């Protein structure tokens, strides 16, 4: 009765054991129920098909503001943090986002409390309070959220595009909103934002525009009754789905050139083509077909040629979402110094490639290759995490029939050459939009974008330029991709070996290498993870060598790109990056052809021949990259400085770029052989592989290095790890710096506890679990210090402690006092909490720590974490949780009194203050809860001096793991 329809069989992958049931409630809400008797966390998500695009013209950000307010209380549950508190006490988490056409809410929680969480959740769409007091506070959270984006190049460009299209089209709206648009201007215009929020929620949060997805251990029938009981009561206003048939870019918006001044020193070219909404053609995705070809990076591609000419390093092409009724097709690239001087030529090449596609006509074998690949990917798809899974499904239930939601955006069906020609016919000079981003335009622009202040200039593209592009002929350098040879064919799951182990086992332990191995015994998918850590002191010995290690690997990946792109498309991936201890290499994906790719990579790194041009280009990009860090957010700088202050050896960005200029091709070529001459390899091979195969891969890596690099074993005494600085009892240091880009402050407070150990770990983690929710509700919700308010444990070099991070317009010393006041409030709150509440927290942590991985890479990452930290505690979770359950409320109080309290005898505190741009100075020390009086801190003026004047902690001892 309350149900209008129960969908047929929900097409799923045969490897998927979860159960699905699709249905449509009488109110129009589309639902997808998911039963998983094994899930440790249950989850729900609801997506309302309306967003910022529906904001009233005079109240920018209203829909986003509504999203924030829905968390602050409902008639059934008044407490403004009843929702977040409930989830916190039950190992849950929640978040939501607002797009142009969607507002998505989601959460996860212990599988035992799905109903209680879902009940509180459903009230968001039934009886929101939109409390006046909450409204006046949370508006600051929205403003702060916008504030951090103001100096973000991505957002500036995002809003600039909107500002250059039809001013009458809702696409031009500012969706984030801020204090001005949500409070100041409305008050001046005599508008009641409270009413407007209610009016907005009332008019658009209709059941006919809602989709829900629930996942839990309960059966489909029980989940059906749960959902019907909590959502069938949502009212249906039969609201029409907003449509946007007229494209934001009309004739007068075409053949336009935009010159933009970025905040960071970046060089980019954006080419955009207005196109019809292609959503309904999803069965054949003509837009993705053209993106696949245009954005391809293999031999013969547009990228390959643009890179060879030394004009660009990266490229992305394909369709870009707009909204119901309109989309875009883009071709974006970064620019080298020379590329910036040849923009017209680059675009010409772009049209020559497009002309090549027209001349060859749609290629069915290409479509088929992707189709078969997507079929393989869907079949062996990794099991997703509940929260993200429900959120995603809730969103696509709006575009595909119930039975197709799982396969919709995965499987390709019919080849439609006619639709492809239709889209391709839109990629012409006469309907192109070009935007160039570069600091070279500074002082040369004449327009300012109102919301972000972006400096730019608009010009019509000369007809003679358009005409030359229209006459783009064929370029012999452009060819269609060749058949992908990395496509996997062997998907057999090797039978579990008789001596297989539940945790990684040390099957090789020599001076040259230490091999950890584990055959997958849970997922049974034709995939594997091959992780290799290459140790060498010459990777971080000094700034110069750090730069060379980076440059070397960056150049190696750049030369392997054409070759590796195909592998990537075939689900075979790899990551190679320099570390403070050497190099990191990870190959993941289908095990079938992993050996081929791995061998190629090792062979290449040991016989690598640097290309001078590529070298100069990448070095130049690296220099800007280091300099661009000055444009990062305050809290990012705070974390950066703390890291530099607390680690034994750490080269600063400034030291790195100062040494960069001395990096020459000759020196780099000499560097490589030296780096590979001596190494130690610690690996972790995990997945659909056998012990002998594992030993086989390791031997191949070694043999390749030995044969081409003459690599020899490193000395054990050379295998040095860095220590963390040891702070003195009752000590308090403050490091202060200014952020020259953002006009907001940032701060990080670090309360060092002690070396990591079962007891110390759980003391800290339990306490963090207990203060987690209260910290956010106090410093942000109540006090509204900023959008970014974070607390939690900090682990580094075997040491650990409590950390607080905040980004606010308020000065650091004031922020410091607030955090200190909060600590006093927590103390009191803990002494008064009931055993019932306390035990609830212990259980909350227990579930969080015991939540099991859903995919191979997640399980592997945990093992890798134990190997990298060199603690090798593979059964850590069971042990620590067992110990956790014995902690009492008294233990936590003592821990707080001896380590964290303001007058704690073993308090170890350091604070990093990052001042706002407009702040010339600021003290380091200074209704609302009462803040305690603090001591005079020692101001750090030189990081080197600071570290030198303090002792260093020892390194953690390895949890012995005996094996061959």
């Amino acid at each position: 009765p309350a149900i209008k329809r129960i969908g047929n069989h929900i097409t799923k992958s045969p490897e998927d054991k979860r159960e699905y049931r699709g249905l449509e409630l009488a109110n129009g809400i589309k639902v997808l129920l998911i039963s998983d008797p094994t899930t440790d966390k249950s989850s729900a998500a609801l997506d309302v098909h309306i967003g910022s695009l529906s904001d009233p013209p005079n109240i920018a950000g209203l829909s986003h503001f509504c999203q924030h307010m829905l968390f602050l209380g409902t008639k059934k549950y008044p407490k403004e943090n009843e929702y977040s508190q409930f989830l916190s006490e039950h190992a849950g988490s929640s978040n939501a986002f607002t797009s142009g056409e969607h507002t998505n809410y989601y959460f996860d929680v212990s599988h035992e409390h799905l109903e209680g969480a879902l009940d509180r959740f459903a009230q968001f769409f039934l009886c929101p309070l939109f409390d006046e007091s909450c409204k006046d506070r949370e508006v600051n959270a929205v403003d702060s959220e916008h504030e951090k984006n103001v100096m973000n190049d991505a957002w500036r460009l995002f809003q600039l595009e909107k500002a250059t299209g039809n001013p009458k089209h809702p696409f031009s709206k500012f969706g984030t909103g801020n204090k001005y648009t949500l409070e100041t201007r409305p008050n001046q215009e005599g508008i009641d934002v409270r009413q407007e929020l209610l009016k907005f929620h009332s008019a658009y949060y209709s059941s006919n525009l809602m989709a829900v997805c629930v996942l839990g251990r309960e059966s489909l029938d029980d989940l059906t009754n749960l959902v019907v009981k909590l959502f069938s009561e949502v009212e249906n206003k039969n609201v029409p789905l907003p449509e946007f048939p007229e494209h934001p870019f009309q004739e007068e918006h075409l053949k336009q050139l935009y010159k933009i001044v970025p905040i960071k020193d970046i060089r980019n070219l954006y080419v955009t083509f207005p196109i019809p909404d292609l959503q309904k053609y999803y069965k054949s995705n003509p837009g993705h077909y053209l993106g696949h070809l245009i954005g391809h990076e293999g031999p013969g591609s547009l990228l390959s040629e643009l890179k060879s000419k030394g004009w660009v390093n990266t490229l992305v092409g394909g369709q870009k979402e707009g909204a119901r009724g309109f989309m875009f097709f883009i071709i974006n690239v970064d620019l080298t110094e020379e590329g910036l001087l040849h923009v017209e030529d680059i675009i010409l090449h772009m049209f020559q490639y497009i002309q090549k596609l027209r001349a060859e006509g749609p290629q069915e074998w290409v479509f088929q290759e992707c189709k078969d690949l997507n079929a393989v990917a869907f079949r062996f798809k990794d099991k997703e995490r509940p929260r993200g899974y429900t959120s995603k499904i809730a969103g696509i239930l709006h575009y595909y029939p119930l039975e197709e939601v799982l396969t919709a955006e995965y499987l390709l069906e019919e080849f439609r050459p006619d639709l492809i020609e239709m889209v391709l016919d839109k990629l012409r000079p006469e309907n192109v939009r070009v935007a160039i981003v570069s600091k070279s335009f500074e002082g040369k622009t004449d327009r300012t974008e109102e919301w972000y202040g972006t400096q730019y200039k608009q010009e019509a593209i000369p007809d003679e330029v358009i005409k030359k592009w229209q006459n783009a002929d064929l370029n012999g350098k452009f060819k269609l991709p060749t058949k992908n040879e990395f496509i996997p064919t062997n998907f057999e799951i090797l039978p579990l070996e008789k001596e297989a182990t539940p945790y990684p086992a040390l099957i090789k332990d020599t001076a040259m290498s230490k091999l950890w191995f584990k055959q997958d015994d849970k997922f049974f998918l034709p995939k594997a993870c091959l992780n290799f850590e290459f140790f060498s002191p010459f990777a971080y010995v000094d700034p110069l060598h750090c730069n060379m290690a980076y440059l070397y690997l960056e150049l190696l990946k750049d030369s392997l790109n054409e070759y590796a792109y195909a592998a990537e498309l075939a689900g075979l991936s790899y990551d190679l990056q320099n570390t403070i201890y050497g190099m990191y290499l990870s190959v993941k994906g289908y095990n079938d052809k992993q050996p081929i790719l791995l061998k190629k990579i090792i062979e290449k790194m040991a016989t690598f021949e640097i290309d001078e041009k590529r070298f100069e280009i990448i070095k130049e990009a690296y220099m800007r990259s280091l300099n661009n860090f000055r444009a990062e957010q305050p809290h990012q700088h705070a974390m950066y400085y703390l890291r530099l202050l607390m680690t034994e050896v750490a080269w600063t960005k400034d030291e790195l770029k100062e040494a960069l200029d001395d990096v020459t091709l000759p020196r780099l070529k000499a560097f490589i052989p030296q780096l590979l001459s001596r190494l130690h390899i610690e690996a972790l091979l995990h997945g659909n592989i056998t012990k002998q195969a594992a030993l086989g891969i390791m031997q191949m890596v070694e043999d390749t290095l030995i044969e081409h690099a003459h690599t020899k074993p490193l000395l054990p005494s050379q295998l040095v790890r860095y220590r963390e600085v040891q702070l003195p009892d009752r000590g308090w240091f403050v490091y202060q710096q200014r952020n020259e880009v953002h006009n907001n402050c940032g701060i990080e407070i670090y309360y060092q506890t002690d070396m990591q150990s079962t007891s110390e770990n759980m003391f800290l983690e339990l306490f963090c679990q207990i203060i987690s929710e209260p910290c956010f509700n106090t410093l942000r919700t109540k006090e509204q210090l900023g959008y970014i308010v974070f607390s939690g444990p900090r682990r580094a070099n075997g040491i650990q402690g409590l950390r607080f991070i905040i980004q606010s317009e308020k000065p650091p010393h004031y922020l410091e006092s607030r955090v200190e006041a909060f600590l006093i409030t927590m103390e009191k709150s803990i002494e008064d909490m009931t055993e019932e509440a306390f035990q609830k927290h212990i259980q909350a942590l227990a579930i969080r720590r015991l939540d099991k991985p859903k995919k191979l890479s997640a399980e592997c990452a945990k093992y890798w974490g134990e190997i990298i930290s060199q603690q090798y505690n593979f059964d850590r979770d069971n042990t620590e949780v067992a110990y956790l359950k014995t902690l009492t409320k008294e233990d936590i109080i003592k821990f707080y009194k001896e380590m964290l309290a303001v007058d704690a005898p073993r308090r170890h505190k350091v604070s990093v203050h990052v001042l706002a741009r407009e702040m010339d100075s600021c003290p380091v020390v200074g209704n609302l809860s009462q803040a305690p009086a603090l001591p005079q801190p020692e101001v750090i003026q030189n990081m080197t001096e600071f570290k030198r004047g303090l002792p260093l902690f020892p390194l953690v001892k390895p949890h012995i793991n005996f094996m061959a």
Binding site: H64, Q67, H68, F71, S93, S94, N95, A96, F97, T98, S99, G100, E145, A154, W155, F158, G175, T176, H288, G291, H292, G295, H296, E297, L315, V316, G317, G318, Q319, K320, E321, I330, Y565, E632, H635, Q636, M639, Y640, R643, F776, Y787, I788, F790, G792, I805
Partner: peptide, 18 residues
């Protein structure tokens, strides 16, 4: 590579290094 709208969140859940 192939392209595969900036959207606003309620909270940042992990703080990160960057």
């Amino acid at each position: 590579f192939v392209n595969q709208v900036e959207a606003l969140y309620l909270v940042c859940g992990e703080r990160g290094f960057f």
